[PDB]
Amino acid sequence: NITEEFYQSTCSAVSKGYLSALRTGWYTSVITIELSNIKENKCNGTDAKVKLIKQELDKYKNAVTELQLLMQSTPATN
Amino acid sequence: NITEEFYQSTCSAVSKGYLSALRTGWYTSVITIELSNIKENKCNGTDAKVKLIKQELDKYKNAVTELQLLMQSTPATN
Amino acid sequence: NITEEFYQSTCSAVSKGYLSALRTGWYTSVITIELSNIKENKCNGTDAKVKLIKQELDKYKNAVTELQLLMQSTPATN
Amino acid sequence: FLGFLLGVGSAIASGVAVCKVLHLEGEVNKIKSALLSTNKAVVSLSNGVSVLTFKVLDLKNYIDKQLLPILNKQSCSISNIETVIEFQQKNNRLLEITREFSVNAGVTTPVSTYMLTNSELLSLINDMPITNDQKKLMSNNVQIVRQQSYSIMCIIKEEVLAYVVQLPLYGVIDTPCWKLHTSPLCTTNTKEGSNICLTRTDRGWYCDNAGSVSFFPQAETCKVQSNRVFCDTMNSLTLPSEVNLCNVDIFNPKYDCKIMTSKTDVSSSVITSLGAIVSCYGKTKCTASNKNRGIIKTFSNGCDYVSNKGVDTVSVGNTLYYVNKQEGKSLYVKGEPIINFYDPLVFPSDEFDASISQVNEKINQSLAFIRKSDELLSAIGGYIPEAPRDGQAYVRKDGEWVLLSTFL
Amino acid sequence: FLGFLLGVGSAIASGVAVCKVLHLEGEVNKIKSALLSTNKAVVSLSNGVSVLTFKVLDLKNYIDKQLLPILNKQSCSISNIETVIEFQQKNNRLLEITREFSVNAGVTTPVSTYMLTNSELLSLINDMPITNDQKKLMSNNVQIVRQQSYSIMCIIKEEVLAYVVQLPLYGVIDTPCWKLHTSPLCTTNTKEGSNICLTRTDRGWYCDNAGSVSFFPQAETCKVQSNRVFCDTMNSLTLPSEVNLCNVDIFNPKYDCKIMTSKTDVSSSVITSLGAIVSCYGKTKCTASNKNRGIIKTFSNGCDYVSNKGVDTVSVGNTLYYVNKQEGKSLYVKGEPIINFYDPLVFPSDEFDASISQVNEKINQSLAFIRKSDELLSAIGGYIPEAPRDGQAYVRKDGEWVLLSTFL
Amino acid sequence: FLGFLLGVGSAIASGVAVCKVLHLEGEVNKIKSALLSTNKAVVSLSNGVSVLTFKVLDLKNYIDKQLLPILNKQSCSISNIETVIEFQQKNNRLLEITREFSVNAGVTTPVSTYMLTNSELLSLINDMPITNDQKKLMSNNVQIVRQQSYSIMCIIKEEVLAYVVQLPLYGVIDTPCWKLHTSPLCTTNTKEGSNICLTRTDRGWYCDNAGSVSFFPQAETCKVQSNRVFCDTMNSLTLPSEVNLCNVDIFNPKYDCKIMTSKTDVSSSVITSLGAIVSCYGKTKCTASNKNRGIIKTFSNGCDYVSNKGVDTVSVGNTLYYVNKQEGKSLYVKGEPIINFYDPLVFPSDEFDASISQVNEKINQSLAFIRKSDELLSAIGGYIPEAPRDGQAYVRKDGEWVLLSTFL
């Protein structure tokens, strides 16, 4: 497998026996999540289960709107 | 919008047309979370709901004490 | 506590009064999690509680198999 | 990269000062009383600074009001699985904040959504004492605002957990900015080590600021949103406006342009905003390729440029680069490579942090040494040798020694 | 480190191009229709590129079918704590994805498990248009694949949230690779500042590629899995195969080996794959230690090596190093340190980015100046001085001036 | 920054060795049997090393005992929403650990709270074989301990998932430490490129250790808790105690102080522990400002210092710095800038990694060349020219050539 040689003249060492895996290109894939367009959160419900559902739906709505607000800024790394 | 010029003499390029947003100062705001001082976890309850409440309250207590132990070390970045 | 001296001749400053804590060695401890070897997910149950248990058990199985697939690659940092 | 010339600041010095102020007597009580009927109020501290204050979570109210009215007559068994889930939801944010500060020693950056949600941050921006232009800019670029912010944990006392969020102030807005890309400029010889090379070292971002130019050498600390550039002045150098003269004429005397010299001719590419710079040297195979046509240009040795219109890929040796597909107009400005003007014999080839004038001075010194030696060598030739040592006198007739006896 | 000679690429240029294509009219509708009866399909975009498409989560189906059939006759109170938990489980992945993109400005790396689970990534690898060798390699090293991947957020419209995952393509596989470790090589004098030092600057990873050698100077960007090396060509330099000649003979003329020079003799160690290089200088105490025997070797001044068999610890001054315990064979190749061959008087001792030939040229120039001055100094000695200024003529007899009157 | 002189270690070499030991036959069975009646025990491995072992989570017990007694007579439908939530709580820690190792290739740093909670880490510290002083130090600075720790995943077999947590050992404690800040020191000329500059390159942390000084050039790898400094010796250089002489006298012969030279005069500031160093050059406007008084000092060209008492802000050009408000005493030590002593004509102005002696040697060589040329030039003037070439003999009367016929 792996072997190593030390050169005293130049104070250096070389470790041989490795195999390559070089990133030479890029493959791009599109990952999608299907979303639901909801507007009517109307519910005259005081049940705690109803309140939990309302909280989780608000979280979903906030996530979607936050992603949209991110989308109004085009992607760029620097 | 964005324009670019390449100078063959100096092997350089300049991309013009961008707009600035420079961080020139700092604004500091205080964010607070109100906490509850609890000591009596006394409960002779074997109900599983009671055990779950006890676990989540212990998590809260551990978080508060861990933050206090962090506070015994004043903040400093290096 | 902390004192500082500025040398105008060399345009340098020295801050004295600090105490040392130098990492000179390593102590290694083994942290273990006991796992359960399960194979029979057989259950003719349509109850929603049963479905939730099945989902959480599949998550556990996926985590264990993913860790095993990680283990087929020996640890090394570079 | 000119990053070693940058200064050394203290990022959270202002925030740590506010933390220290918060530890004074009565400061936490002032904040607690101010945040009694509202989640957001302005508080004047003991040092005269007015700071916005947020109450983002009230675990005291949720634990003492809901929960904890369980009649613990040995039972305490008053519960509903809803309030168990609800308490987990409320307590989770505290747990996540504690987790983050545990692994970051009380200082975090960027400010996470657990530390400050989008709605809270937008509300904070709305009430900051800044221009409507600055409010609009911060609101439209919340993700950049988070990236340029610190969260410092101050104090936990008097049933209050307080941390300061240190937000950026963009005092310079909408001034023109430009980016400078540089690539090595060697001679085109095929042999190894037989080349002289030069490279502009002033690459980075430049922005007009208060009649000067703020220069950011480490362009990786600047975030670009379409046509906008977000930069930190603590990572900047202030330069005269004449630094732009290095782009129209590198030999101008009004500004001493920064270069470095080398003898290593290695092929590489620099991907610019609207194109690619290709430095091809030696026997490297450099090509520009299209996704529908294949290789459409083979670069010759030297420094060349190709725009992104019609080109999707540049390959330099075994390295393949994708060019940016941003829309814009590119212009090729023809000129003779300045490396042609330099004599390799007297060329200073290990100037790591140098300038046009400094290189010219060193060449002048080397040529002055050559001229001084030649002048001494030429002046020596005007003198006369020694007459033969043979016991008889000699006289100088024309340019040679003749015996005195001939003339007696 | 030769990292300053590397080029500048654009990591997510290809992914951003796919995002821009996805914004064209009808592109999102094409993807939505394609992902109607399956979670995975191949879609040809308007620009002629075929891209794999995944539907990893269907919140539209779970909210409209299950949930939201609550008969809101003022009640809406149709609920089961199971579907509350189930909705939290489904919605949590969206929340985590939104969290990650909020703190990373829409581009993340490595691709987290929330962005792409192991099963989805393995399925994606299985259907990629690559060799079975490449599929096997990516599947066996999923953690490395994640580390070399970007997640770019494209678009959220038409009830579709889409982001591109940009995966690596390993086009070079199973070619031999080797790693070069270098340590400073000074003279062994005990005094401070009385030493000349030299160091090879070409340390890093080397791999055979298309008849050349891809050289990765910043070896910290290369990930090693046992005997396999994962590297990015965008962080590589392409070199001729003769670069390996610097390991058999540093003075070979076919390749100009890269070195740097200094006068600072400081002790340090370099941990290699199967051993440790120790550079001991001055009065530093350098030792090799065993866990069952203690100190088993005391290094002398100079550069030395010890294998990992029988040695578990190397201490250089106050710094203690653990050596790697990897199995393998080590070989010591004896030779005289090349620093012995250099005369310190004419030794260029501040060559930061230099080469063997460049250092030899500078030594030649310094010796040429010495010889030129000596030749001028020697030639001057062959001329004659001025005869005494005393009002009487003088003649040159042998090597001195004698009065003309003596010969009249 | 002297970071290029540092060595190269292997951070998790010791931990990987323990992982390899754990793969031997019977090692996992030994650990499993040892952790039968307790969550914490000391185990001696096959190589003679005793390591503390923790069982932090028992999913085997929770799945086989509670849960999985569901009488699967086609039903399996034995369940309570409590045990569904409880299983989610227990299983979540395993999921988070799997997530972290998936994105970090089995090695993580800092050790997260999921990998080791505070109570487990404190218990681990309590039972480590170290001094009570070291136990107290680690317990009081748990967040720093996490930051200087690695978590390496070893093995998953025999119903056991095992990873090693590699904790720091602070063998040097309570020795005095000091920090050195350096700023460029140019001449104060207003023109560009007409200045010679010098800068001390030995900035960083210094700590007394075993009669030597451990020097940490990259001070960003050292974490400061109030008056305590946490540093890694693997990122250190060992120096003689005489390195402190560079602070009392930079021209001392007992230690060769490290400097760099340049001709680029650029304004910057360095924020120190108790003040700020201001390097003002050219026409840059450098001011020191107070939050209640405004600008209270305008710096002149050169290098100056101001303490943090009475000063809250230093502005250099378009860059604004907040000074640290730490309490302490500052002292200004007056002296003439050493750059005044250097003649710009013979000043080596591109010494990137140099020293006081090395710069003095180069100046000596340049002056020696000047003197050697002048001595040759002066000695040549003592010789005699050629007599006129006109066919008649000439004799040397006083300092000129007169015809021989005049004296016959």
UniProtKB/Swiss-Prot annotation, chains A, B, C:
Which residue spans adopt a coiled-coil conformation according to this UniProt entry?
50-70
What is its subcellular localisation?
Virion membrane; Host cell membrane
Attached carbohydrates are found at N1, N44
Assembly notes? Homotrimer. Heterodimer with fusion protein F1; disulfide-linked. As a heterodimer with F1, interacts with host heparan sulfate. As a heterodimer with F1, interacts with host IGF1R; this interaction activates PRKCZ/PKCzeta that recruits NCL/nucleolin from the host nucleus to the plasma membrane. Part of a complex composed of F1, F2 and G glycoproteins. As a heterodimer with F1, interacts with host RHOA; this interaction facilitates virus-induced syncytium formation.
Q: What does this protein do?
A: Major determinant of the species specificity of RSV infection. The trimer of F1-F2 (F protein) also facilitates the attachment to host cell by binding to host heparan sulfate. F protein is involved in the entry into the host cell through the interaction with host IGF1R. This interaction activates PRKCZ/PKCzeta that recruits host NCL/nucleolin to the apical cell surface where it can bind fusion glycoprotein F1.
Q: What is this protein called?
A: Fusion glycoprotein F2
**What species is given as this protein's source?**
Human respiratory syncytial virus A (strain A2)
What stretch of the parent protein is included here? 27 to 104 of 574
